[PDB]
């Protein structure tokens, strides 16, 4: 939301100094002259910058800062002196930074100078190349700092590389003149023997390594995984790396960004990846709800190649319909709250299917109308208004 708004119009400036922001058509000196979208993005950027301050100075020290502010205010709140002490209930920026420096011993003045006083987000364009001879991974990260909303980042940058030997984090120092970052790569001895490949968490899984390159061990790369800067990343992986990142990652933002990047690769391996995500309980439900729409877009792009039925129809009849009647939907029992959301989002994406003539097929429209006719809600303890409203959608 904030990178869309700041690249759209100028930027949000937390803590201006009194104009400080002349790129935008109102004055930021008073709350009653702000646009309402600017007020909303102001609150949004403020809580993300506080998450960044928690990233630099750990969460227990952050809660100690907040407790110190509240304790000064509550010793202030019981005095009777007319504001000799009632102004300890008012916080400022300098007092907040001083309380942070009191509890932690680190000051955050570079982070405050970059993300508060400066009003911009950063844009990262990354591309990699694997050097087989020296066994290194040559990343190439360049910033677009000449757009109207952007600024230049010179700090450190975390990158997480999943190779066959596991998941390794690397810190890169991205100075102004930097372009190529050579990080080292590990072995490929988990392709010699079939062993399980260890993940970002402690677990390990069986991966189908037939799509991987023979010479490179690395399975996927993520630039800034923890969202530790206010950034927009445009990484150029290969399509099998996006499919491996969609399947076997233990991070929902990486699964979402792989869904978002698989729309450019309409190959049938990506259709298999999104269909395996859709069938998979123990995936987070908002990833499957995105995979519905991604599968609809991919299915629209590979018409005159699609083999069987329309997308997600057989999967809908496998998950939510009767075993004896495929075209009759099961009676509504909405007590699971994840297959309820997936059931009410799957025909909405299924209706975006189009034939070679650019008209929605009469197999999906008939399916949606049979979902509407055979709807029986006399048996669940929950209402049907959102599911029926999504059927109209």
């Amino acid at each position: 939301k904030i990178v869309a708004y700041e690249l759209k119009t100028g930027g949000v400036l937390l803590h201006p100094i009194f104009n400080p922001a002349s790129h935008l058509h109102f004055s930021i000196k008073h709350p009653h002259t702000l646009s309402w979208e600017y007020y909303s993005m102001f609150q949004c950027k403020a809580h993300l910058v506080m998450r960044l301050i928690e990233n630099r100075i750990s969460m227990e020290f952050m809660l100690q800062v907040f407790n110190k502010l509240l304790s000064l205010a509550s010793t202030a709140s019981s005095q009777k002196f007319q504001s000799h002490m009632w102004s300890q209930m008012l916080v400022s920026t300098s007092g907040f930074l001083k309380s942070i420096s009191n509890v932690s011993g680190k000051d955050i003045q570079p982070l405050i100078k970059q993300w508060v006083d400066q009003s911009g987000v950063v844009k990262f364009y990354g591309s990699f190349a694997f050097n087989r001879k020296r066994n290194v991974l040559e990343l190439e990260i360049k910033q677009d700092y000449t757009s109207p909303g952007t600024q230049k980042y010179v700090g450190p940058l975390k990158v997480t590389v999943q190779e066959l030997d596991g998941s390794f984090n690397h810190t890169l120092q991205i100075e102004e003149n930097s372009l190529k970052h050579d990080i080292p790569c590990h072995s490929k001895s988990r392709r010699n023997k079939k062993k399980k490949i260890p993940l970002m968490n402690g677990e390990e899984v069986d991966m189908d390594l037939s799509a991987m390159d023979a010479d490179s061990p690395l399975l996927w790369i993520r630039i800034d995984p923890d969202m530790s800067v206010l950034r927009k990343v445009e990484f150029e992986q290969a399509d099998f790396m996006w499919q491996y990142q969609l399947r076997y990652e233990r991070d929902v933002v990486a699964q979402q960004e792989s869904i978002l990047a698989l729309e450019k690769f309409p190959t049938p391996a990506s259709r298999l990846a999104l269909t395996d995500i859709l069938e998979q309980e123990q995936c987070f439900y908002r990833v499957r709800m995105s995979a519905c729409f991604c599968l609809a877009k991919i299915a629209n792009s590979m018409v005159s190649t699609w083999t069987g039925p329309p997308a997600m129809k057989s999967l809908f009849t496998r998950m939510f319909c009767c075993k004896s009647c495929p075209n009759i939907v099961k009676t509504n029992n909405f007590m699971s709250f994840q297959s309820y959301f997936l059931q009410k989002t799957m025909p909405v994406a299924m209706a975006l299917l189009r034939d070679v003539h650019n008209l929605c097929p009469k197999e999906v429209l008939t399916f949606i109308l049979d979902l509407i006719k055979y709807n029986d809600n006399r048996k669940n303890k929950f209402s049907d208004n959102y599911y029926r409203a999504e059927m109209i959608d």
Binding site: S127, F128, F130, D213, A238, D239, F265, P266
Partner: protein, 394 residues
Amino acid sequence: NLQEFLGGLSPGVLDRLYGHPATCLAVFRELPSLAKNWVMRMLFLEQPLPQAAVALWVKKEFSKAQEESTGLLSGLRIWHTQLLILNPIFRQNLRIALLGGVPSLDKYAEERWEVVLHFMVGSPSAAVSQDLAQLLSQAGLMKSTEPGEPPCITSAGFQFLLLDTPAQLWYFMLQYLQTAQSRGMDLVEILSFLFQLSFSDSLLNFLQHLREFGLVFQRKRKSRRYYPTRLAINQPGFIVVETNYRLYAYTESELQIALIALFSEMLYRFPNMVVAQVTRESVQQAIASGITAQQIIHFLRTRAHPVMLKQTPVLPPTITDQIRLWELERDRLRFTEGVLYNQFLSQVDFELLLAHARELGVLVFENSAKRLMVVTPAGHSDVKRFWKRQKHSS
């Protein structure tokens, strides 16, 4: 072949080359089977005839002979459609050609060719002739690079050496004509003499070169009259091959012993016989020099003693197979120049880039499973631009 040589010519040189005395007859004899008769037929016609008649003038069976003869004679341009009357000049010359208008010599030719081959090989004693040496050097079978030192023998030289006398001489004369054009000697005038043999300053020099090759011999202190030898118009074997890679050759002329030593190890030399061994060392030495097993096998077969002619095949299968295997073991590893890009991302987008390097001729090997393509550095400035254009298209 002479058919190839004459086919590789223009109409302007062809009609001039069709001289009255002999050419119209020498080129006629070339006509393999049927073109003789049709040409004879329409030797007396002053009126062209339709092509359909010629087409239907051969039965359905064996028509391929008709088409091949018609194509060959169309290439020779003996006639013109004129709409198939023969060329008037050729018709007149052919009508004028049809009722209109030694034991010491062969030995001399043999000895002269033998001494020529002795000079070709590294023989300390051989006939000396600067013109012959430079002619052989420019024929493509010899390179000197140093006038003071005697010229060595190139790879093609050994292959030419191992050829039989007829083909050897024919190829030598073909190269002679090709170099005659380069040096400026008129090709037509010299060529007509060869045809006339089988029945000016340039002529005198050409005849001198032919005499040096041994095809002709004036015998009268270089008089106008000449008596061509047998080779000018255009024998039992002596090697016995064992099953243990042993050759017993009844050779008295040093040329045969040298030729055998080129690909065999000599052991004994008797007055009327010589013993050699065909070992890996000698065979691979010849192969490295440039020979291939086919020439060695053909040479041994043609110079096969009558004793081993009774057995079929004449050359033992073990010897032949061993020679072939020895030649095959010679080459394994390779060499090329290339550059590799990677990360081709989209599957359907990488297939379009494969056709760009294949049409230009800079593609070595590809890979649709890993999206990898090797491009030679010679065309690197053209593939990258295409890739950039594709990226721009998106």
